[PDB]
């Protein structure tokens, strides 16, 4: 049983509010705790493919609090990873691209792109790619826009093969618009690198999902559009020549 | 994106633990805040049709905490309602039966069984019905209290006025159907059909079609043509049927 019909969304948003409360309080104590990491993971999971909870997170000034946690734990790679994963989920929601147009946020993301932990800079790069995705809606410095595109492209190619699988996905759909951005080599470079990574680590899961959602097409279109970045093209053909073996 | 595969289960159980922490906090303080009852509703909803988070609730001392909530706020309508609703969700899980066989627990539930605010006695009755529905040997406590409760349940339901606004909601009637077959213990049957009738009379657009699609017509109707059935139970059952037509 439960209280009444439709009562679960209210409790979901209430849970988001209370998790933000625990984040704020653990930040005030400077307590990198097991419960703090669990709370950041919970927030990250709840924002997965749910723009309503992303909007509730933003409307409860969650991103300001996440800037604060980034600044109060500058060396904690796990904290940064979970924070940036949630912020990536937000960067995927087009209706809220407006409220990530804030230079303190963009500055912290650009700084975290140069982390020597690929588990951190990967999500920094994802945020960056999904923000440059929108052509300009830029609302800020075009200096910083061009700078961060170039930095995206360089940083991706400086990445090693990760040890674990740094992330999970239930759908490759948010990657498909980033694959058509032939104008922005870094964005599709991040997309192709991430898909390659997840199928290389977990083919059992993501090969079937990548083919079923029609992504082999986006890859094949990149394959011989002659206005393609050699690096993006090489990653695309590698993904194809691995996904072709698996039916 | 999310942390890793299967992380959603860990996140949900962590949420259960933290909500229980908020409950213990606002019970140590005698603070009946908005967030306390919202936490109670959140826990209640998370326990709906999910044996897993109910098991986690029990494993995180949730039973003792909830009865501390009961003993510290004996006048609070919504608080007792939500507590007893979550415990009703626990009671429908057979594997956790032995956990609810606590003496003080059954005592408090039998006390709240006789409360006149139906929003409370209803869920207390649900707990007791599900408990003694599982047989005599399964009752590891005072059998005197068991065979007294299967009468006090019957009596408490007959004295019930019909509720006003939304008291409860269900996603499926499947936990009720095993109760409908307890001809040996007619209080269980009577609670089951009374609940079905109430929810089908206030929200017929949802619940009667749900009841038919889940095949409850056949159980109510078995009660119909099963002779030697309790007269109150039979009355309510044929009543549900005659407009389920």
Author numbering:
A (entry chain A): 479 to 613, 615 to 726
B (entry chain B): 479 to 723
Task: Provide the authors' original text about this structure.
ZER1 and ZYG11B, the substrate receptors of the Cullin 2-RING E3 ubiquitin ligase (CRL2), recognize N-terminal (Nt) glycine degrons and participate in the Nt-myristoylation quality control through the Gly/N-degron pathway. Here we show that ZER1 and ZYG11B can also recognize small Nt-residues other than glycine. Furthermore, we present the crystal structures of ZER1 and ZYG11B bound to various small Nt-residues and uncover the molecular mechanism of non-acetylated substrate recognition by ZER1 and ZYG11B. In conclusion, we propose that ZER1/ZYG11B not only targets Gly/N-degrons for proteasomal degradation, but it also has the ability to bind a defined selection of non-Ac/N-degrons by a conserved molecular mechanism of substrate recognition and target their degradation through the non-Ac/N-degron pathway.
